[PDB]
């Protein structure tokens, strides 16, 4: 017997509502945080917004040709006609995706635009048995489909070293030393409730849209396979997360190939 | 009336914005880049600190007297249809503060209009005496948000070095700081709106995602009923005419014209 603890945690900010349900305990809909559907900042981030620094395409079509600068920047356009990733997409070692932007001569409905169109999957925040809150899909999601962005507060590396709660962090590591993270503890979208899984049905991909400042990629989760309606969403948190949390608790992921229990 | 474009915005607006010409044989303008939202070339350190935003904690649709966001703008001037109340002072607009992502209310509350985008069927057309112009293709009730003046966000000293100043809009309040929106190289439909001494459009300074006073956004609202086919217009102000006045005189044709 699952009780509806919220009609939509996003409060209309997403294209579709994201309900919350409980059928495990008496815990109420989470509220010790603020829902934001887009990345925000506290301390000012020097993101390069210079519109003339943007690289862009001058296509006269729907950006399906190999001449599209944006596709070239992404090595090639990885989206098919339905906005899904092509099969020859390296899920184990994702390339950076550069979607068309407002500087491109193309139309707002060209092919190289997917993450920028927001959430299009009916998800649901629900209470699990062991991991607490989790997220699941109320519909079938085909492989290579864009599901959700990992949205939170943009903070510096050092800023990350002075925060008690660090279970809601995503590193945007760069061999440039210039390292940043997205902390969804205080500010975050539905992704902050996604749990870890060793054989994840979601893989994070670095995407670039309105700007192309490589220090600040936005994280878009794509389905690594067919996800069945009712299935819980999951993604690999990575070695740093477990390398520090692996000293506090074991991985309740329950995967036959699990790598952190 | 030849159709030179099905949509100059290329799909970036909620509705398309066609472009026609039944005068000369000039093609759809293209010596500029259309942008549905403000942009910057040189950096502008807009205060985007989310903890700096003021907001409301309303448990309703922000249509009560306790919405803090409404109080900031003295009161919420929007009605259930998103139109400005009859008591709104067109000749002396107040600063409007729409609800933002920091508020506790829902994304569909009453205090959100300009952040919702273009919803009036407009059209860029070729006029006979003022070059290009924007007209309405539908009746537009008074107090209706029509469009925003979007362009390049530049400083005072920067606009001061730009020879071409026909597409500049001043955002002032001296204190060592004063900014403009240059729509010459980057702008939306509003760049094609011609001047009029008895305008059916009035600029209103609005704040939404951020509340950095140096950067209000310019929202145009109808000052009266605008019927289908009528050309849009707003007062360019004194600085514009004090300058461009030395070259040509106004041609709005208003019996009460103040610059011809
Ligand atoms: C990927 O998931 C995680 C990413 C995390 N990233 C960081 N960063 C800050 C320091 C490393 N920097 C190079 C990368 C960003 N810190 C993290 N945690 C910090 C939190 C503050 N603590 C303070 C501290 C230091 C030493 C001993 C005890 C406590 C240091 C580790 C994370 C934790 C994560 O999983 C929990
Ligand atoms: C509202 O419409 C206008 C606003 C304009 N604003 C400005 N500003 C810059 C100086 C005054 N400052 C306080 C307000 C913003 N300059 C303006 N024009 C300046 C541009 C630079 N020129 C000098 C120039 C000439 C040739 C080449 C380079 C520069 C002097 C007039 C405008 C003009 C406008 O109508 C045309
Ligand atoms: N595979 C896994 N096994 C055990 N706990 C997990 C897990 N994946 C995520 N978690 C738990 O959830 C935190 C990640 S944040 C996800 C939200 C969380 N389940 C909640 O109810 O708020 C971790 O610190 C951990 O406590
Ligand atoms: N009432 C008016 N009388 C004469 N010229 C006007 C005018 N309103 C606008 N303009 C003309 O347009 C410029 C403002 S920008 C508006 C766009 C312009 N009509 C175009 O076709 O690109 C002015 O410098 C002037 O040349
Ligand atoms: Zn292209
Ligand atoms: Zn492009
Ligand atoms: Zn494109
Ligand atoms: Zn596991
Ligand atoms: Zn309110
Ligand atoms: Zn509010
Ligand atoms: Zn509100
Ligand atoms: Zn006049």
From Swiss-Prot, chain B:
Widely expressed. Residues 54-117 form the Pre-SET domain. Zn(2+) 3 binds at residues 62, 99, 105, 109. The record marks 149 as: Histone H3K9me binding. Zn(2+) 2 binds at residues 56, 69, 99, 103. Residues 156-175, 236-239 are annotated as: Interaction with histone H3. Coiled coil: none annotated. Residues 120-237 form the SET domain. The ANK repeats recognize and bind RELA subunit of NF-kappa-B, when RELA is monomethylated at 'Lys-310'. They also specifically recognize and bind H3K9me1 and H3K9me2. The SET domain mediates interaction with WIZ. This is Histone-lysine N-methyltransferase EHMT1. It comes from Homo sapiens (Human).
